[PDB]
């Protein structure tokens, strides 16, 4: 919760950088918009490097991507 | 049974199906943080952006085999010493490959769920974990594939048995109407593609020497 | 009497295993044929004549970059206290170049980086105006 | 908001001013003026007497330090080594430079996540104080590590 | 008492401590001394490290996994293990007349001249780390093999990790 | 159960071997993957050394291989 | 899994170490360096007087050789003689050639699973020791039997 602890409290979002200011001229550790430099390297879903899910619904379980490949990865089995 | 003398199930199923998906998709995440840890490593290896032709032209895949034989029925063999092939032709990119499109495996958390079903809960988390086992090597072969390929052409355009692709650019000026202008126009268009010579009376040959003392 | 053999490491996974095993492959592919391409065509001058070295070329540096060759490059000469001049025009796809060292003087780093641009681009230095000056390549 | 992160990772602005706090009392000086920041080693807490070996126990003041710039989030560090005058210019500048080399790669053995260092040392050319009466001891033979937080 | 880089190179004066500590009985120390300062627990401290020793007939060697005692494809010593180090000096002390060869073996994967070249630095600086403790000039030589005689299998993980090595060998005569 | 027994326990699973490693540089003898060297000389099932079963289901009890030759062996008797 | 095997057969980590620990107790020096092994035997705990003629009681420790030897799996065992220096260079070579011939026959009858086995007699050619005064008694006279480790 506490972004600006040992500083004065949060004064504003600066949008231009995405940061909060604290109530001393120090800039602060908390993102405030989603345009902020975070270091994003773990992302979550299938189909990743290819065109994303091809959004028939399927009678079978297979998972195919934009591009033609298919997940047997995300592929429920039998 | 055995000797003369010796003579004289749905929770199955369903152990096993709940236990393959969350086998796969907890080694599905462990192989991705051992990837993510040796980012740098890979990027050195797979050095794709230093294999790059002349005009941004990725160059093309070439496969090789030794000491080759057919049976092709009873009656009739055909025996070779090497051949090599054109798997994939070169192409303009407008940036390189890089190792994150083959290796990188694919994670969802699988949120969806007494006597003997730990023990088959525990069989299905196996075969979970060996099939992503065999996913991930079959990619590595796929990413060892494209550089290898690229690899020997290198080595096959040095020794003078392929060609190098030929591109021609037309320059036009200013053009366009009162609505619309382009300063400098430039066309470029590769017009002859690479391929192997079956002339073998140019080909060179490499003699590597080793002196010391 | 406990009996032992001497390196006894950290545990290893399987997939390491095969990423090396892919990796040693590799590595000696491009041993045999970097070997046949110096036989084959021998070089014979070096660039130690194009970016020569002076004074205050002889702070050091270590770096990790991944990206295009220009800012790199005006860091380089800003530190080394020389202006900084482009020549040409920048092509359409950038030149992305990749630096992994340690510990070498910016003499140096410049020459690596001579020596990844390759055919695109080029490094001069002129000592006596103290210029660092990188020109694209007439190519497209 | 729960899958992206809220913050930089490992930071925290408590913990900012609690290690900026516990070095200016211990004697490192640490400064900012608008986004550049200095932290001014003396050379007598890390190294013999003009030598370029580190003591055994300067080395948990070099973790300390790496620890605060773990903090921030940053593209280029310099370090620059200056010392005092003993025998000629060519020796001092040696020394200067080979303090710097050392101090640099232990901060990047450690994890500072900075794309590029820079290592220089300047010899006895700026002094910053007109009493040069100590040797070593001396105020103006110092170390020092500037950098600019980036965004 | 003890400077933990090497000492400046200065013969600790070890028993000392514990006379003090056992006076502070003399016997009992005088016992834990006699102890500890034998061959056969400096024997089983190079045994605690990762350190093996081989001796057969009157010739004997000590074995030095480049792993754990030097950074990472350098020539630069690692100082985190300056107790097997001076566990080294200390076995060596007790035999002042013999010659002495150190050879530096690495394995398969790289160019022949680097690995040469590396063999050849990292034995000069075990050398030099010897020669640095007291032991005269005459009596020493290094040399560096490539992958020359494995002992080995090089296409395992394993083996391939036991085949980096330093080999100490001396005489008695 | 116990592989590494008088040695320090299992340090982990070679796989370019397909062999455990001790807590001491040894070798264990137990195996841990399936692609490792077993020396394997006795094998069951029937139509060895043909193509296998050839997976018809037949009224009568005659089991035929792949390669037409008929196994009276694994054929129940009347 | 209940029909694969699970290790290979008759083998055992903890009778290895046995093993090894009663050999070298007993006196027969076992030595391991990398994957290559080492068994040492000094001939008086073999052999009659420089006679080609084995004790009864030593074929128990041949038995006790030949059950360490088949915990392993190997392609090629090597067995050499040397003795020590009597009447000419030829009566010692021909005396180590047989002592090995018949020292590898017992351990080829006795179910060792290699695929070769290599004979040689040295005579006195190779010394480990510069202590030359006993006989037999000598310790420089003895069979040693190396193999490397397969897989």
């Given amino acids: 919760d506490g972004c600006c602890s040992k500083m004065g409290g949060i004064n504003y979002c600066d949008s231009s950088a995405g940061r909060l200011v604290c109530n001393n001229g120090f800039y602060s550790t908390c993102y405030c918009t989603r345009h902020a430099v975070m270091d994003l390297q773990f992302l979550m879903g299938c189909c990743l490097w290819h065109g994303g899910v091809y959004p028939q619904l399927n009678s079978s379980g297979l998972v195919v991507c934009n591009d033609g490949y298919v997940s047997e990865e995300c592929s429920l089995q039998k | 049974t055995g000797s003369l003398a010796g003579l004289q199930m749905a929770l199955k199923e369903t152990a096993l199906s709940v236990g393959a998906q969350a086998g796969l998709a907890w080694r599905a995440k462990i192989i991705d943080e051992q990837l993510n840890k040796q980012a740098r490593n890979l990027d050195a290896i797979y050095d794709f952006n230093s294999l790059v032709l002349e005009h941004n032209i990725l160059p093309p895949v070439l496969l090789e085999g030794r000491n080759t034989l057919n049976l092709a029925d009873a009656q009739s063999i055909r025996i070779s010493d090497r051949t090599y092939k054109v798997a994939k032709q070169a192409h303009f990119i407008t940036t390189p490959p890089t190792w994150r499109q083959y290796l990188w495996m694919d994670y969802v958390k699988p949120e969806a769920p007494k006597e003997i079903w730990c023990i088959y809960t525990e069989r299905g988390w196996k075969n979970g974990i060996d099939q992503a086992n065999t996913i991930l090597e079959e990619n590595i072969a796929r990413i060892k594939e494209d550089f290898g390929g690229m690899i020997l052409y290198r080595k096959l355009l040095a020794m003078n048995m392929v060609s190098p692709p030929y591109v021609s650019h037309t320059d036009l000026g200013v053009t366009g109407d009162g609505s619309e202008i382009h300063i400098d126009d430039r066309v470029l268009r590769i017009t002859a593609l690479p391929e192997l010579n079956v002339n073998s009376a140019e080909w060179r040959a490499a003699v590597a020497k080793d002196e010391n003392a | 009497m406990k009996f032992k053999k001497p390196p006894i490491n950290n545990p290893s996974d399987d997939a390491t295993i095969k990423l090396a095993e892919a990796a040693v492959s590799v590595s000696d592919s491009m041993l045999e044929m970097a070997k046949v391409e110096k036989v084959i065509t021998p070089p014979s001058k070096d660039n130690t004549l194009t970016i020569p070295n002076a004074y205050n070329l002889q702070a050091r540096a270590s770096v990790d970059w991944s990206g295009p060759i220009e800012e790199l490059t005006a860091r380089i000469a800003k530190a080394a206290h020389f202006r900084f001049r482009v020549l040409g025009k920048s092509p359409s796809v950038p030149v992305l170049i990749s630096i992994s060292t340690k510990d070498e003087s910016l003499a140096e780093i410049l020459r690596d980086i001579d020596y990844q641009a390759g055919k695109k681009a080029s490094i001069h230095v002129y000592p006596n105006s103290q210029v660092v000056e990188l020109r694209y390549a007439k190519i497209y | ?151 | 008492c003890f400077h933990p880089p090497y000492n400046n190179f200065q013969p600790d004066r070890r028993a000392v401590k514990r006379v003090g500590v056992d006076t502070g009985g003399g016997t009992v120390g005088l016992v834990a001394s006699i102890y500890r300062d034998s061959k056969r627990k400096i024997i089983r401290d190079l045994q605690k490290q990762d350190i093996q020793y081989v001796e057969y007939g009157d010739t004997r060697t000590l074995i030095i996994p480049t792993d754990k005692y030097f950074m990472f494809s350098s020539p630069r010593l690692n100082e985190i293990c300056y107790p097997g180090l001076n566990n080294v000096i200390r076995l060596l002390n007790f035999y002042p007349q013999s010659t002495i060869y150190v050879a530096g073996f690495t394995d398969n994967v790289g160019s022949r001249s680097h690995k040469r070249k590396l063999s050849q630095a990292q034995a000069e600086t075990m050398m030099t780390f010897l020669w640095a403790n007291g032991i005269a000039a005459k009596r020493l030589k290094a040399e560096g093999y490539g992958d020359k005689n494995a002992i080995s299998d090089n296409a395992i993980i394993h083996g391939s990790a036991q085949n980096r090595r330093i080999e100490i060998q001396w005489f008695t005569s």
Avoid: H
Avoid at chain 4, 42 to 51: K, T, V, W
Avoid at chain 4, 56 to 78: C, D, G, H, M, V
Avoid at chain 4, 125 to 133: E, Q, R
């Fill in chain 4, 1 to 151: 908001v729960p899958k992206l992160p809220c913050r930089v990772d490992g930071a925290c602005d408590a913990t900012i001013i609690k290690m900026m706090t516990d070095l200016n009392k211990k004697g490192i000086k640490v400064a900012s003026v608008g986004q550049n920041y200095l932290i001014s080693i003396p050379a007598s807490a890390l190294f013999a007497d003009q030598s370029p070996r580190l003591n055994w126990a300067s080395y948990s003041l070099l973790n300390e330090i790496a620890a605060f710039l773990k903090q921030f989030r940053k593209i280029a560090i310099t370090v620059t080594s200056y010392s005092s005058k003993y025998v000629s210019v060519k020796r001092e500048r040696a020394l200067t430079l080979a303090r710097s080399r050392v101090v640099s790669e232990y901060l990047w053995s450690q994890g500072v996540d900075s794309r590029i260092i820079f290592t220089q040392g300047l010899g006895s050319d700026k002094p910053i104080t007109s009493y040069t009466l100590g040797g070593d001891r001396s105020p103006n033979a110092r170390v020092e590590i500037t950098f600019r937080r980036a965004v």
